[PDB]
Specification:
Helix content is 0%, strand content 48%. It is built from no helices and ten strands. The protein is globular and about 40 Å long. One of its GO terms (molecular function) is sterol binding.
Length: 129
Amino acid sequence: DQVDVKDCANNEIKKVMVDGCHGSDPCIIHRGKPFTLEALFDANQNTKTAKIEIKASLDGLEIDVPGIDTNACHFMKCPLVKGQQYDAKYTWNVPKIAPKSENVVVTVKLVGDNGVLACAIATHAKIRD
């Protein structure tokens, strides 16, 4: 369902959805299984590129989020047009060995030729079995 996120750019993101999660409820991420999200955002520039930058911290420790194709143009119709609305969807296989945590912070940035396209900080994720 639609979930609560904090915007870390200029509110370009209009809606974020995460399969199995809702609003500001703790969003359970079951390690070893597919995690799917979808976000709608308005492009704030004309750009040939769109690159995903992700940061995740578990109980304060930064960790590397492996296996993500950071070229969003591999899944959106680039070049992106200023003012147009894009539907970004991603399904990521959560590694079975990801450490369980009840205190997760994930920052996902999207960057274009001329700066940040979008940015959201998620603080409700919980990694469990």
